[PDB]
Symmetry: D2
C-alpha cells in the first residue's frame, strides 16, 4: 500500500502544497529544491504530524548533475517511485524586446530543461511501477499573454515535451497540470494575495491533485486546467 | 449546505455514474433523459440509499420544447440550481462519405444543440448561484480519428460552444469534461467491456468529477482530460 | 493543361473573387449558389473577357438533393474536377442565449453540413484527379469571439471535418482557408467597407489562393490564415 | 519600389530558395549564415543574374553578439528593412531519454533563441516600415512526433514566440511558415531526396512565400502550413 512521491520545487508554493496533500494520503515523500532549510522544516512537520516518511535533498533542476545526483539518492532511499511531480518553475514578465538573455535562459533551464531532466531521471522507475508523472506547466501552455513571451514559450515547449514523453512511454501516465494564477512566490511575489485579485490558493490545487491521484492505477489523467473565478476566462 | 445538481443523459453510463457520485456528497438531483423508467429506478434507489432528494422528468435534448419544459419543472421543484451536467451524447462511426444525413443530424442535435439548449435553459439560474456547468464532450473535442468525422466535428463544436458560454458569462463556471473511451452503451455497445480493451469505467469518471466539485466555489475547473492506460495516447 | 474548378458561394464575395482569379489562370469553372442571376452575369463576363469555359447551376448547400443534382450536372458538363472550393457560408452574431434555433440551424446546414455535402459529392472525382478541395472556414475555426458562439462552433466543426476528410482520403489535397474579416455581404453587410475598419478585400484572398494553386500537384497546402493589418491580432 | 529582405539560414535549403525567389521579384537582399563562402557564391550569382543588390555577412544566431553585429551591418548597408526571414534552424531526432544536453541546447539556441534574437534586432526597423517578419517553424509547431521531443518542443516555443511578438507589435506583420519535410540538409541529410519519399522541394516553398509576399502591404499572412502529398497527413 505504501507509495512514493517525488516533488520538485517542494520548498514553497504549489510543490509544498502538493507534498502536504499527498502526505495526508500517506505517501512517502522525496522533496527537492534549492532551499534545503525549507525542505527540512516541511519534512520534520509532515513526518510528525502525518506519520509519513520524508526524504529531502538539494536539487537545482537547471543543472544536469544535480538532477542526476538527486534521483540517485531518492531511488537509493526508497527504491522505485510511484509519482513524480515536476513542478519547479519561474516566470519573468516583460515585452520580448526587453526580456534579457539571462531571464530567458533561466526560464528555459527550469521550465523546460528542468522538467526534461526530472522526468528522464525517474523514467525507468516509473515504467516499472506504471507510475504517474505530473508536470506543473500553466494555463498558458496553450494560450498567449502580453509580457509573457519568454515564460509562455517555455510552457508551450513543456507541454510538447510532456506529450512526447507520453507517446514514447505508453507504460507511464503523464499528467499536465495547468493552473492559472496562484498565490505563491511566483513572479517575484509573496503569498498572502487575496483570491479576489484573481488567484487560486496552492492548497486548492493540491487538493485537486490529491483526489485525482486516488483514482485507480489504470486511469490516466492527462490534463487538468483550473483557474480562479476572479481570473478572466481567456483562451 | 444543500446544493442541487441537474444531470442530462442520467439514465445510464457516465450521467448515471455522476448522479450516484454526487448523491454520495448529498446533492439534491434533477435527472433527465428519454428513458423515464430508468430514471425512476435510479431515483428511488438514491433517495433511499443516499438519503438525497431526487426529481426526474422526461428530457429529449434534441427538442427545444422538451428542454424548456424540463428546465421549468426542475426550477419549480428545487429553485435555483448549483450544478448542471450537460452529458447526453451519442456517436455514429463511419467514413465521412458513408455517414448518413440522419446520423449526422442526430449527433448535431444532441452533442451540440442539446448542450446549447441545456446550458441556456439553466443559465440565469447558474448566474445567480455562481454555479457550475459541466459538459461531457470527449478527448476528441481537440483531436481527430478516422471514422469519427461526424462525431468529432460535433465535439469540436461543443468545445467552442462551452468556451464561448464561458467568455460570455464570467459569473458562471464552465467545466469541459473530456473522457476517452468509456465502458457504457455509447456507440451501440453495452457495459461490461474490460478495462484492458481500452475503457475507463463510468464510476471512475464520476469520482474524478465528484472530488473536483468539492473544491471551493471560487475555483473554476475548466478542463479535465482522462483516458484508460489501455487506450493509446493520441493527440 | 485544362483544369476544372468548382466553386460554391460563387455569386458574390470571396467565392466570386476566387472564380475571377482562377479564370485569369485559364481554369474552366463550375459555379454554384442560389442566386442564378448573379452566376449568369459573372459567367458571361468571364467567358468573354478571360476566354474560359463557365458552367453555372442553382445550388443550395443546405439541401442534400440540391448538392447531389449540382454535382451530377457539373460532372456531366466537364468530366472530373481538379479543384473544389467549398466556400458558401454565413454568420449570425448574438450572445448564445439570444441566438435563435433558426439562426443556429442555418449556420450548421451551410457552414458544416453544406461543406460535408459539397466535398462528398465530388470526392470520387478528386480522388481520381489527385485534386484539391479548398474550404473557406475562418480564422475563428481555431479561436473564440464574443457573440460568435453559433458561427464559431460551426467553423470549429468545419475544421475537424476537413481534417478528417484529409486523413480518410490521403490521395486528395485538402486546403483550409482561414480569412479574418473580409469586405463582402457576410454578416448582413454590403461591400464597400474600407480596409482601415479591419477588412481584407475578396480579390486579395483570391490572389493568395490563385498563386498557391499554381504550385505543383504534389504540394499540399493545408492551411492558410490571413487577416487585415487593421484587424487586431487575436488568437 | 525597392524593398529589402533579410534572410537567416541563407546558405542553403529553404533560406537559399527564399533568397532566390525574392530576387526574382527584385528585392535587395541581406543574407546571413555561418557559411560565408556559400553566401558569397549565392550573392554573386543573384547580383549578376537577377540584377539585385545583395549584402552578406557572417551570422551565428546562437550568439547574441553575432546577431547584433549582423543587424547593425545590414541596417547600415540598406537602411530599414521590409522583410525579415528568420529561417535558420536544425533538428536532432532521438527519444527524449537519449537526446543529449548538447543537442537540446543547440536546438533551443537556434530554433527558439535565434529566432527571438533575429526578430528583436530588426523589430524597430520593421515597425517603421510596417514590414513583414516570416519565421520558418515547422508543421510540428502544433503537433507531436516520436523522436521529435527536443525539436518539436523548440518549434512549439517558436510558435508562441512569434504570436507573442505579433500581439506586442500590431504595427508589424508576423508570418509563421510551417513546412512539412523538405529536401534539404536538415536532419543531417543532403538534397537530392525524391518527392515520393515525402519531401517538398525548397523552390516550391519559396514560390509559395514569394507570391504571398506580393500581396498588398495591408494584408497580414499569419500562417501557412504545407506538406508533400507523399507525407502522411498527421495532425
Ligand atoms: N503562481 C502562479 O501564478 C503560477 C501560474 C501558472 O500558470 C503556473 N505556475 C507554475 O507553478 C509551478 C510552481 O510555481 P509556484 O509554486 O507558483 O511558484 P513559487 O512559489 O515561486 O515556487 C517555485 C518553486 O520552484 C522551485 N525552483 C525554482 N527554480 C528551481 C531550480 N532551479 N531548481 C529546483 N527548484 C527550483 C523553488 O524552490 P527553490 O529552489 O527552493 O527556490 C520553489 O519551490 C511553476 O512551474 C510555475 O511556472 C505558477
Ligand atoms: N462511452 C464513450 O466511449 C465516450 C467517449 C467519449 O470520448 C465521450 N463520451 C461522451 O459521454 C457522454 C455520455 O455518454 P455515455 O454515458 O458514454 O453513453 P451512453 O451509455 O450511450 O449514455 C448516453 C446518455 O445520453 C442520453 N441521451 C442520448 N440522446 C438523448 C436525447 N436526445 N435526449 C436526452 N438524453 C439523451 C441517454 O439517455 P436516453 O435518453 O434514456 O437514451 C443516455 O443516458 C456523451 O456525451 C458521449 O459523447 C463517451
Ligand atoms: N466576410 C467575412 O468577414 C468572413 C470572415 C471569415 O472569417 C470567414 N468568411 C467565410 O467566407 C465564406 C464566403 O463568405 P463571404 O463571401 O465573405 O460572404 P457573402 O458575401 O455573404 O457570400 C456568401 C456566399 O455564400 C453563398 N451561400 C450562402 N448560403 C448558401 C446556400 N445555402 N447555398 C449555396 N450558397 C450559399 C451565397 O450565395 P447565394 O446562395 O447566392 O446567396 C454567397 O455567394 C463563408 O464561408 C464565410 O463564413 C467570411
Ligand atoms: N527540411 C525539413 O525537413 C524541415 C522540416 C520542417 O518541418 C521545418 N524545417 C525548418 O526549415 C528551416 C530551414 O532549414 P532547412 O533549409 O530545411 O535545413 P538546412 O538545409 O540544414 O539549412 C539550415 C540553415 O540554417 C542555418 N543555420 C543553422 N544553424 C545556424 C546558426 N547557428 N546560425 C546561423 N545560421 C544557422 C544553416 O546555415 P549555416 O550557418 O551556413 O550552417 C542553413 O542555411 C529550419 O528552421 C528547419 O527547422 C525544415
Amino acid at each position: 500500500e505504501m507509495k512514493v512521491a517525488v516533488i520538485t520545487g517542494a520548498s514553497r508554493g504549489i510543490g509544498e502544497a502538493i507534498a502536504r496533500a499527498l502526505a495526508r494520503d500517506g505517501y512517502a515523500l522525496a522533496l527537492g529544491a534549492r532551499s534545503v532549510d525549507r525542505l527540512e522544516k516541511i519534512a520534520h512537520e509532515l513526518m510528525q504530524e502525518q506519520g509519513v516518511e520524508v526524504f529531502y535533498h538539494h536539487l537545482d533542476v537547471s543543472k544536469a548533475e544535480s538532477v542526476e545526483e538527486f534521483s540517485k539518492k531518492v531511488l537509493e532511499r526508497f527504491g522505485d517511485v510511484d509519482v513524480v511531480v515536476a513542478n519547479a518553475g519561474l516566470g519573468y514578465f516583460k515585452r520580448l524586446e526587453e526580456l534579457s538573455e539571462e531571464e530567458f535562459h533561466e526560464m528555459i533551464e527550469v521550465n523546460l530543461l528542468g522538467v526534461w531532466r526530472t522526468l528522464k531521471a525517474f523514467l525507468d522507475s516509473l515504467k516499472r511501477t506504471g507510475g504517474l508523472a505530473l508536470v506543473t506547466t500553466s494555463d498558458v501552455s496553450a494560450r498567449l499573454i502580453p509580457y509573457g513571451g519568454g515564460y509562455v514559450s517555455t510552457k508551450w515547449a513543456a507541454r510538447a515535451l510532456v506529450r512526447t514523453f507520453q507517446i514514447e512511454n505508453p507504460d507511464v501516465r503523464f499528467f499536465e497540470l495547468r493552473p492559472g494564477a496562484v498565490d505563491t512566490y511566483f513572479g517575484g511575489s509573496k503569498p498572502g494575495k487575496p483570491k479576489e485579485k484573481g488567484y487560486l490558493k496552492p492548497d486548492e490545487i493540491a487538493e485537486a491533485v490529491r483526489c485525482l491521484l486516488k483514482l485507480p492505477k489504470d486511469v490516466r489523467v492527462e490534463e487538468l486546467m483550473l483557474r480562479s473565478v476572479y481570473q478572466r476566462p481567456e483562451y
